[PDB]
């Protein structure tokens, strides 16, 4: 009963944000680690939905699914360390940031159910704002446990769900194509109508 249009229902599903490749050989990540800055716009449809308002406040829930490029399941161990905002990030496999006790880690196996954690509201202000006339959530670092390189190629996929959603000050929805990230810039030489057109005003 009008409970599908609430904001909690509007933002209620886990969507794929981000993907990490750890190839056996190549140039994508020569080592066995990667850094992924947390963002909600990894999901393609998220930006236009969130930018309907000016201020937002929510928690997050992350799930990690790992497998071989073909989809196989292999006996491997991973780390999944979380770097809070304002803290240094790893630079190599031998970096000392991988064992700093203030960065929580989740040791898990591939032959296991996907890992799941929760992240609270991490802003100094009272809400995130997508427009500032004048939003760091953290970082996830993924590696393979060991002093030697792994024997398999791996892919990690991250899914995020938002909980306890609140919003303020609605705005008009986006009309033109985006050009940059965190920028309302638009192609000024090609402006398109909001919808379709017809031949005359007197004809259906």
């Amino acid at each position: 009963s009008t409970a599908e249009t609430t904001l909690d229902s509007f933002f209620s599903r886990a969507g794929l944000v981000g993907e990490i490749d750890l190839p056996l050989k190549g140039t994508t990540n020569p080592n066995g680690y990667a850094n992924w800055d947390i963002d909600i716009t990894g999901y393609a449809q998220m930006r236009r939905k969130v930018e309907l308002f000016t201020y937002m406040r929510f928690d997050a829930e992350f799930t990690f699914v790992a497998c071989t490029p073909t989809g196989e399941v292999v006996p491997q161990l991973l780390q999944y360390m979380f770097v809070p905002p304002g803290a240094p990030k790893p630079d190599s496999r031998e970096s000392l940031a991988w064992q700093t006790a203030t960065n929580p880690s989740v040791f898990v196996k591939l032959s296991d159910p996907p890992a799941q954690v929760s992240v609270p509201f991490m802003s100094p202000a009272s809400a995130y704002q997508w427009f500032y006339d004048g939003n760091m959530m953290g970082t996830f670092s993924v590696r393979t446990v060991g002093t030697s390189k792994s024997k398999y190629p791996l892919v990690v996929r991250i899914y995020m769900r938002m909980k306890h959603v609140r919003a303020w000050i609605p705005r008009p929805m986006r009309n033109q194509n985006y050009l940059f990230k965190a920028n309302p810039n638009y192609a000024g030489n090609s402006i398109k109508p909001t919808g379709t057109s017809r031949t005359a005003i007197t004809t259906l």
Partner: protein, 178 residues
């Protein structure tokens, strides 16, 4: 009539008449930024740049006087955190259809707004409370909101009448804190 933005009056935690804009037959629209528009004016302007933390509400009156043989319509609206995509005299809209920011003008009536129809009325009053994610901010580095005046219906008249219509904006700070 008088509308109160989001149904909230300014609270705690004189009149300033700017120059006159001349509405023409080919005008596109103008906008002003707050509190940038009142930073070089008077005691408010001195306090804005001679302090560190600022917090204030506002009351905006827009008027225009025209004859009974003129026609046209204007939309007046207030948009918090109005970032522009591609002083006290304001700027001019280059692409009024996309509000110069990639958003449609047809949905601008979702904000605190008023209509000026030359055949019906000539005044519009909007009261804006303080909107921010923090109790205090900087008056010289952050613009809280912007004010828009866009002619939805073009100005028209007959030859021999006055070809420019004056639009005057007068505003008064409310519950200001420094």
């Amino acid at each position: 009539n008088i509308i109160v933005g989001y149904g909230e009056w300014p609270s705690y935690c004189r009149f300033y008449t700017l120059d006159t804009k001349l509405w023409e037959k080919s005008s596109k629209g103008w906008y002003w930024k707050f509190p940038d528009v009142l930073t070089e004016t008077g005691v408010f302007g001195q306090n804005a740049q001679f302090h560190y933390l600022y917090r204030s509400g506002f009351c905006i009156h827009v008027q225009c006087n025209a004859s009974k043989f003129h026609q046209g319509a204007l939309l007046v609206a207030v948009l918090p955190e109005y970032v522009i995509g591609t002083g006290a005299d304001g700027f001019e809209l280059q692409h009024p259809y996309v509000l110069d920011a990639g958003i449609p003008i047809s949905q601008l009536t979702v904000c605190p707004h008023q209509w000026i129809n030359l055949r019906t009325n000539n005044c519009a009053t909007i009261i804006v409370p303080y909107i921010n994610a923090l109790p205090f901010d900087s008056a010289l580095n952050h613009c809280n909101f912007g004010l828009l005046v866009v002619p939805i219906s073009p100005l028209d008249y007959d030859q021999g009448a006055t070809p420019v219509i004056p639009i005057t904006i007068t505003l008064a700070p409310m519950c200001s804190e420094f």
